[PDB]
Design a protein around this ligand. Sequence first.
Ligand code: ADP
Ligand code: ADP
Ligand code: ADP
Ligand code: BEF
Ligand code: BEF
Ligand code: BEF
Ligand code: K
Ligand code: K
Ligand code: K
Ligand code: MG
Ligand code: MG
Ligand code: MG
Lengths: 520, 520, 520
Amino acid sequence: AAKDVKFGNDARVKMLRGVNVLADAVKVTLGPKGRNVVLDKSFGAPTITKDGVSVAREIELEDKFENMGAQMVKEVASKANDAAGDGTTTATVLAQAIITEGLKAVACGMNPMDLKRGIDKAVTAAVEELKALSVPCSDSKAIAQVGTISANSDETVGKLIAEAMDKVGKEGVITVEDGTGLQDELDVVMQFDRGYLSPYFINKPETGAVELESPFILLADKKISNIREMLPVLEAVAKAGKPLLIIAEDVEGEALATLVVNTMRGIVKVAAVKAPGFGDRRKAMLQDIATLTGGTVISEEIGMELEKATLEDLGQAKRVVINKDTTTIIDGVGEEAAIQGRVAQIRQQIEEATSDYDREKLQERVAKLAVAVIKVGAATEVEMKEKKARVEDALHATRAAVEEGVVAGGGVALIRVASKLADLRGQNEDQNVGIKVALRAMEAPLRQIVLNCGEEPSVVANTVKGGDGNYGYNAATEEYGNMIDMGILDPTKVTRSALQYAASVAGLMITTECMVTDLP
Amino acid sequence: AAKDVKFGNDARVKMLRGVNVLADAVKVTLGPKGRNVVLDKSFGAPTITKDGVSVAREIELEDKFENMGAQMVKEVASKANDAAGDGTTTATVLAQAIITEGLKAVACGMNPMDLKRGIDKAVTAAVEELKALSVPCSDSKAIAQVGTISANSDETVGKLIAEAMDKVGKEGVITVEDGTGLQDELDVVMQFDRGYLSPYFINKPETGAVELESPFILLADKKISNIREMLPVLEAVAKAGKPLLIIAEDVEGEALATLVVNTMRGIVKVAAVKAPGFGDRRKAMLQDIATLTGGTVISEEIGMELEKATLEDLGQAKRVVINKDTTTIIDGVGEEAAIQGRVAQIRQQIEEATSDYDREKLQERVAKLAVAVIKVGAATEVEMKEKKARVEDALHATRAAVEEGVVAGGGVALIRVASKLADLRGQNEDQNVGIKVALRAMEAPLRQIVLNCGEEPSVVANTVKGGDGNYGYNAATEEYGNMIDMGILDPTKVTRSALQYAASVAGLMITTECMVTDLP
Amino acid sequence: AAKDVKFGNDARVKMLRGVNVLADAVKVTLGPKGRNVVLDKSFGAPTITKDGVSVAREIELEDKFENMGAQMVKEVASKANDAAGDGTTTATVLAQAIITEGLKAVACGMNPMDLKRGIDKAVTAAVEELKALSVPCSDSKAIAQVGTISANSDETVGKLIAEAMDKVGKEGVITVEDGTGLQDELDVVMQFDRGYLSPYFINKPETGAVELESPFILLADKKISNIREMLPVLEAVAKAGKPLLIIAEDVEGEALATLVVNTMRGIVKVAAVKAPGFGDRRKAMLQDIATLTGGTVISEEIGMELEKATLEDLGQAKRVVINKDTTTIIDGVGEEAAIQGRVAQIRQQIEEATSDYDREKLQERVAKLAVAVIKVGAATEVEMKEKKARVEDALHATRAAVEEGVVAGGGVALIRVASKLADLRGQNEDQNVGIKVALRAMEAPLRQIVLNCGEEPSVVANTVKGGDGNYGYNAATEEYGNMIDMGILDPTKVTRSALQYAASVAGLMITTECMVTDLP
Ligand SMILES: Nc1ncnc2c1ncn2[C@@H]1O[C@H](COP(=O)(O)OP(=O)(O)O)[C@@H](O)[C@H]1O
Ligand SMILES: Nc1ncnc2c1ncn2[C@@H]1O[C@H](COP(=O)(O)OP(=O)(O)O)[C@@H](O)[C@H]1O
Ligand SMILES: Nc1ncnc2c1ncn2[C@@H]1O[C@H](COP(=O)(O)OP(=O)(O)O)[C@@H](O)[C@H]1O
Ligand code: BEF
Ligand code: BEF
Ligand code: BEF
Ligand SMILES: [K+]
Ligand SMILES: [K+]
Ligand SMILES: [K+]
Ligand SMILES: [Mg+2]
Ligand SMILES: [Mg+2]
Ligand SMILES: [Mg+2]
């Protein structure tokens, strides 16, 4: 289509106006005295949220150029989220603060492409300075604090996540789901998403689930349809007394029908459940189970018949629990040598994972061998969703603090790094201004946090910069102090991520001399 | 699409204006001197109703922001309904009254997120205070009163529900349907909607129905067409003397034809009726019958032939009654262990029911095992529907009073709790104002009830607050007295639910600093 | 969609304006000096009609609220029609007259919900008072009068319906159809809609019909295709001399072909006709015939072969008449014990009929055992349809007078009841006004009838109220007298029905404080 083409200052002013709308909608949620944003949503009720990326993703403006502005800087907030899990508002606030200052310089005749070089240099330095300030965070008290600050000063959420990480370990997974109840709730477990195939197996109608006591476990790679194949193994289990779980690709009617009438009567106690997964991942996961239980995968492809299996090839467990949705193996017989060998193998499979998706499902399996769910409580569903948004953010920050340490919150970390880089220069004057642009932007987080409390950001900024180390402003309590002593901890990873991403995008945005878009 | 983005006070004023339209449409129905709302309805006649949620669900406003207001607070009324069954108007009135007072504070510079904390704290306290005031309600007189007040002072409805609960018990179900007649009507019963397949079975032409005395019961999952399958079992029943009921998927002509000539002559006494339901629900229900009668479901799918059944697999009952429309099994042989085991299973099936429809049919079956129907009478159909709306509400309130006690109605319960929390404070001033916001809102129900009588709400409120305990205003009679003595009982569960839900939503709504929606 | 929401007086004024349009279109047809309404109709010619519900059903207004008004009160006219069959205009006139007076009171500050209670009480009383005044109506002269008044003073229609009810009895059915001729026409009949299957059976080419003299009757449930099955019975009829009628599901070619050549020659005299009905109704009706004729239904389903039938199982009749369209059995051998037993069975089948359709076909069969059609004559088709509309109304009123007696027409019945309830009071003042609202409305029918004659309704009303008993205004003749002596009879059922339904709806309509509808 025919295009509208704008140049120079006109293009930039539009680009900014756009940035500001997105920025201005997100910035209002920053900090403990941050407020919430309402996002209308076509199919049913609107959403109240503090989560900066959530606000950002919805912004789209009418004016084709302004929109372009907002649509580019939206990526800062968005990428922060995909890497860190928190800091999305901070990231957005920095980005604005750069873009704004940079463009002002561009208008003064300075060469954008150098302003960029400055900014980028100042940031590469700031990243390293932050790694210096970073003190690690591994005790449950520190983690609970990060969690708490991350969930907008909700101590329960901190406490609860800290408890969770303590229980699953570090090679273990934590999810968050909507609770039925009014208060928060933590559940801890190997399990996979498969129910009984035969609802006539439930041996405890109390729970509506099958509870096989100290059973054998048959791992069939192929899908079963004839009871002939089972007879040899079913026989040895019938003369052993112990029950049996059958985890094959599928238990077809002809061979299912029978199995039912056999437990129906009490001849053998057997359960049938599909195999966890699809394709090569199934055989991989099915193998994981064999290792935990000390059984052999009866793979039809690698020269085994299901009839030539014996008690030998069956896994064993202390207990088994299966319901309409999930199957759980409690404490398998498999030796911990074989297990941790199998784990350090899958651990290096995640190293060569060049795609995120290949990494997801792999660490899921290592957690099954080395898992927890937090259920979020609230009165209504508008409440549920702002709370659940905070819990996720908190969990992310906690995992990030663990893996990269913490720094003083209240945006002081950045303010310090800015004073430490006060001597940084570039190859020429424009690059210098570029550095100074970035350093001045580093104050923005603190400044906005203070501004959302309705106090004079210049005055607070000055007072924090007059101090040392972890002296900062506690926006919640409205007085100064030692941020680490007051539990106001941001993960290093998030503060770093915010800064890097804002800089990346904002840097480029300053180099805009022409804009091309469709006509209205 | 391009979005309209509004901030701060503008956004809030719009949000309120919206809340008020919904609120203002619902509030007019509050209390005995409440009036009705007419809701136009595209396909045919309009609806007259007092039921506050019904009005709420229809509100949708033109202005995109105002709508957002109304669409959020709509959830208060809506959730009250899903939890309690009554109090939806009250809930809505509170919500408004909070939002309004809170936003006024937000405009005074107070920190919304703290106003929220206050409100929420005041409410958590009020919930506990209400549990103190709650006296239980288990005698039929008290229940009839709750029912009566709930049905806008209709004593018949109270009386009739009280009678119903007395007869079904507490582990028994009550439904409401449109009556054909002009006056109300209660019917009480395991039974299901299926008649005889063969009209030539009626062994008592007095009633035009089959009355099988102390019979066996055959439960066939598959549909029958050949008499071959029957011969083995039919044989053992023919040499046992006792009659037989056959409840299979269907009794086809070839196998039906015969069965007739056999009872025709007196060789065996047999009835044939289709199975209750369709698909997986049929097999589920067919199984319920087996448990009540001590029989086995002869399921062709899970490896059973109909020929290999014996007297073993047949259920038994004390008596059976079947007519053109319904089949009734009176007092089955099944052991109450197996029954209540089967029930506590279906009881937890209703827990995981995430859809309303999955909940309906499940509790229907538990009533068949552990049932009454109220038919509502009215002259026209406009009348039918407002009445039926009141009966449902009443029934809900009665069931809620039973399970959580009652408190003094006329909104006095809340007014008392408010005087008891007069000393409640928070961590800081903004939180205090937040508490006071909630306590002042607690007066709104009484105030609106009085205002719908066209009398001075301040004057009545003052006079009730000057009193003690259950002193209140009786809006119907226009004079003060002891609300429990005057039968003006609200269930605790509903009063609590109203307050909790209003607070949840309204709390969040006060934290609004930005709104994002589509352009017009 | 976005809604328009109106409150209080605004909403009510709109609601009324709507009611009035519908009311005002219907009221013009009231009474003997009533006029007609023309209803445009998309597919072809318009409709002229006096029938008040017919006018009502077409009204739909542009203004969304006014429409709501009209759409609710439309139900009065509509329900009157479904219950009574006449009085739809009267009902509509009352409804208006209540709504109007009630709303005026609501505007004076009186509590709508009490105004309702008053109205309803006054009506429950009026219903009983009317049952007092009701004198029964069973002589043909009285019925002819009701019919006449009902058909807007058309004596022929009265006379003709009176003759009809006299001939079919009270357990007999009357239909009305369009006539081919220019004048009205009554036809009277056991018979059913089936002709000969074989046109080569007509033994009297004068009429073009088969006249079997004193024959046997074979009732075959199954459909016949082979002459083998017939031979046993056909044999015994061939050696008996008497002819035979065969009423089976069908007489197929192979078995039809033969039967023809046998009567063709004079070996046996046989007729073949399909069975009356479809499905379970066929077997039911086929059974009715067996009872009237003293034969057995040879039902293949309940263990009978057609070959094992003998003269035993054949019905018998005095004469049989069959043409291209219908089969008639004149005076069957069946004993009147068995017949009236079969009838009092089908009579109670119509009691449990909860659907209108289940009632239609049942009383059709009782008439066949214990039926008439009125053909309406007119010149054109515009004429046909107003006339046919009056005949139906008349027939309905006659059947209603029969079942619930009559009262003095000209709306005097209601005027009397109003003077008798002059002392009725309620629990409080608002309820009193509510009663007075209803009593004043009871004058409206008379008042409107008089007003359609262009005479002063107040003056006539006063003069009738000054009188006693059945003194009334005869609007046709324009002078006063004894309404029963002048033949001006309304059925009690209709007068009662009108009042009850108007009150039901109008009562509720007065309680309107808010209206919610879509935007324009
Ligand atoms: N009590 C406090 N005083 C000062 N700063 C705080 C306090 N609590 C949290 N913060 C800071 O405010 C920041 C707010 O983060 P948040 O508003 O969730 O946005 P983001 O998406 O950037 O995490 C945190 O980095 C933290 O350093
Ligand atoms: N006669 C009365 N006097 C005072 N209050 C009453 C009387 N009858 C009912 N109420 C109160 O009015 C409230 C009205 O409930 P209702 O209008 O049905 O709305 P909701 O959806 O809140 O139940 C009840 O909680 C009850 O306490
Ligand atoms: N000659 C008459 N004088 C007075 N009233 C009459 C006369 N003929 C009929 N009426 C009255 O007028 C009414 C007219 O009924 P109609 O206009 O058909 O409306 P509806 O639908 O109410 O039957 C009858 O109830 C009858 O009482
Ligand atoms: F805005 Be962040 F995700 F707390
Ligand atoms: F408005 Be409530 F449901 F009585
Ligand atoms: F208007 Be009524 F049906 F005579
Ligand atoms: K945020
Ligand atoms: K209500
Ligand atoms: K009329
Ligand atoms: Mg955060
Ligand atoms: Mg109520
Ligand atoms: Mg009439």
